[PDB]
């Protein structure tokens, strides 16, 4: 004797020892990315190629 068994209810595990099918379908995909940058360029110049006479002391 197996006890009350339903007639229209789906066949589910109910007690200890009942078997159940597991469809293993795992798909995990995690990602991360990052970046940082900095730049700085400078040029300076001053040339008195021909100095006038009133400014040759400076």
């Amino acid at each position: 004797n197996y006890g009350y068994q339903p007639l229209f209810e789906d066949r589910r595990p109910r007690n200890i020892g009942d078997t159940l099918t597991i469809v293993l379908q795992e798909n995990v995909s995690a990602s991360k990315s990052s970046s940082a940058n900095a730049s700085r360029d400078g040029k300076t110049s001053f040339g008195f190629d021909t100095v006038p006479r009133y400014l040759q002391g400076l």
Binding site: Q5, P6, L7, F8, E9, D10, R11
Partner: protein
């Protein structure tokens, strides 16, 4: 008969029960079963319980 027709006793009450079933023996006036999958699913469940695996 006034007190029984006017009052009710505490703890003397009716509950509601619900269930799902199948009705068979209809003269072609049942479900289409193409738009109600649960009818065929539960019929197959009943057959599987009774020993027929469709």
């Amino acid at each position: 008969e006034r007190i029984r027709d006017l009052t009710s006793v505490q703890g003397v009450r009716e509950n509601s029960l619900i269930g799902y079933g199948l009705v068979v023996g209809l003269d072609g006036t049942g479900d289409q079963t193409t738009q109600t999958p649960f009818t065929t699913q539960t019929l197959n469940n009943m057959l599987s319980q009774l020993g027929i695996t469709v």
